[PDB]
Design a binder for this molecule. Structure first.
Ligand code: NA
Lengths: 169, 169, 169
């Protein structure tokens, strides 16, 4: 019944030690809160806004760590270096557009600037990958929008096969 | 100018005769109701949750049967075998994201679990393909969400070319 | 910090001189209104509903003209020749699904027929590309739905690199 979760902070500023990772730290707290998801933090990493590093991390976390859930924070806006959604599209097997939609409607309710977020959500093996905004406020609000559906989503994926492992098994 | 419709049930359980196809049978009734769509059922099949069989059936129904509308039911959730949207993306020529959106907003209005549905809608030749959920309740509600736009959508596609046929024409 | 905008009218009828481009002409007025966007019209063209012509124009306007914003009007519905979204998907580097969403929700609030529009929004270099409907009413409404986010989106993209130019720089 355990939920093993990874939080991937995608941020040049945090990577360069220019700012504290308020968003990522807060997501670790939200994830572990027994009144919320009641999950376990199994992976945490800060990476720069660089497609290959994001992709490699996601693949490792899905295929080697077999996490149930990865929450990315940052790299989903219009700034030129923001490529988290692009990295995510390259690693997912099955897209989950309803989750990206739920987050966008929720965000638009807060502000029209919500349409400047470009998140992708999708599945790889047993892992649900969710792109969240970079700000603490934004990532918390978006986590809140999807939380009601997370336990069931994770449950449906628990027995999925990790494709790269299954071929030599 | 009849509306020729195909209902494709994607279900391992129904395919193996473990359960009755409540969803598909109900969709046949909804399609044919003269107060609703007033369509004709021109094709009906139960297939397992297997990407190639889904793809092959959709292609035959669009290119050989030249159906105006295909309603798929099942294989659109998070369960590992659910690959209907993936099959659909491989066969469509032009995506219709507004229809997938309309269904998802309607569904989210019923329950946040609507974000665990992953439907694709799109066009191939004269055919509009709509992915609906596997459950009778979900497919009925989703059919209702798009019904007001179906007649006009179908009309706009009636004179489309079937690409594989036109090359030897 | 001018906003250099292109308006691309995709319309067989206008291209063949059968109708006046009411939509494109109105978009030029909207764009230049200082209480709306305060933009500059830097490019305007009417092209037929042909994928290659649309793609070639978009690439030229992004890569050679380095426009901040391109509004396309027409070619986004279900009619068989409507291929603007497909051309757009072939040229963008980063999709902006939030903006497409916002336009569609707004449109669905007016009529369910909004779900028969298939717009794509995305980014190439410094340029935001927005697909709008062909009708004057539809393009004006869709522009007005996204307008609140336009200034900030454009600003975030101002220092983006034009990839084809950077490689020989
Ligand atoms: Na999409």
């Amino acid at each position: 019944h355990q939920i093993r979760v990874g939080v991937l902070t995608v941020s040049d500023s945090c990577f360069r030690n220019l700012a504290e990772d308020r968003s990522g730290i807060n997501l670790k707290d939200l994830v572990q809160d027994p009144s919320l998801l009641g999950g376990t933090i199994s992976a945490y990493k800060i990476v720069p806004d660089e497609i290959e590093e994001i992709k490699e991390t996601l693949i490792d976390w899905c295929d080697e760590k077999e996490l149930n859930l990865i929450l990315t924070t940052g790299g989903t806006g219009f700034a030129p270096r923001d490529v988290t959604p692009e990295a995510t599209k390259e690693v997912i097997e099955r897209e989950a557009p309803g989750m990206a939609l739920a987050m966008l409607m929720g965000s638009l309710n807060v502000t029209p600037l919500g349409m400047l977020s470009r998140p992708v959500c999708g599945i790889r093996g047993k892992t649900l990958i969710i792109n969240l905004p970079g700000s603490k406020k934004g990532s918390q609000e978006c986590f809140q929008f999807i939380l009601p559906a997370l336990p069931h989503a994770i449950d449906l994926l628990r027995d999925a096969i990790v494709k790269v492992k299954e071929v030599h098994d």
